[PDB]
Amino acid sequence: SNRELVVDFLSYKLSQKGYSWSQFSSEAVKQALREAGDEFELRYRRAFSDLTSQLHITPGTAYQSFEQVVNELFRDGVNWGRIVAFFSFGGALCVESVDKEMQVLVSRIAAWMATYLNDHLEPWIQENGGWDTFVELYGN
Ligand SMILES: CN(C)CC[C@H](CSc1ccccc1)Nc1ccc(S(=O)(=O)Nc2ncnc3cc(N4CCN(Cc5ccccc5-c5ccc(Cl)cc5)CC4)ccc23)cc1[N+](=O)[O-]
Numbered sequence: 001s002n003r004e005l006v007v008d009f010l011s012y013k014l015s016q017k018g019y020s021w022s023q024f025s026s027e028a029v030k031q032a033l034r035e036a037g038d039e040f041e042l043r044y045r046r047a048f049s050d051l052t053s054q055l056h057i058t059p060g061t062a063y064q065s066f067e068q069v070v071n072e073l074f075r076d077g078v079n080w081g082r083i084v085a086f087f088s089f090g091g092a093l094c095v096e097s098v099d100k101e102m103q104v105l106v107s108r109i110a111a112w113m114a115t116y117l118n119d120h121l122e123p124w125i126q127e128n129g130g131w132d133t134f135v136e137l138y139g140n
């Protein structure tokens with residue numbers, strides 16, 4: 001479910017760069033999230049490029065980089081926009097790992113994302129009306 005969302009979004013972002021999720025490894029929610037991600041990545045393309053140009057991805061530091069950035073993202077609280085950005089960050093990390101021929105990290109990044117959602121974001125999501133409320137507020 002959270003798993004489902006992560007795989008959907010990462011598959012989409014990888015496909016946009018011409019990569020397939022399958023080589024490395026509800027619908028309304030997934031579509032609204034895909035679309036919010038596209039829009040976020042445009043509106044904050046500067047923040048996107050700032051991140052991408054400062055990622056030095058290695059197997060030994062990739063979890064550290066994920067954690068560092070995600071802790072910063074939610075330092076001042078959670079909102080729907082920040083959750084979208086969290087997905088877009090996961091997408092950027094996977095694309096970058098494949099660029100650097102560290103495709104092995106893709107399935108691992110997906111797992112880190114699901115764990116973060118399950119352990120840390122779920123309480124907020126549930127308190128704030130669940131994913132249905134996200135669709136209500138930011139779908140179409
Ligand atoms: C057409 N209609 C139906 C939808 C269109 C709109 C606009 S489309 C959008 C999507 C997500 C976030 C913002 C805009 N939808 C929308 C609007 C407001 C809200 S909202 O809930 O009010 N929230 C926010 N509103 C405005 N701006 C925000 C800016 C935010 N940022 C700014 C950059 N910062 C960089 C950063 C900082 C720290 C750590 C990491 C990063 C980082 C860097 C690179 C990457 Cl790759 C990833 C992370 C990350 C946090 C966060 C929340 C924001 C939510 C949504 N919505 O969900 O669709």
Ligand SMILES: [Cl-]
Binds near residue numbers: 077078
């Ligand atoms: Cl907080």
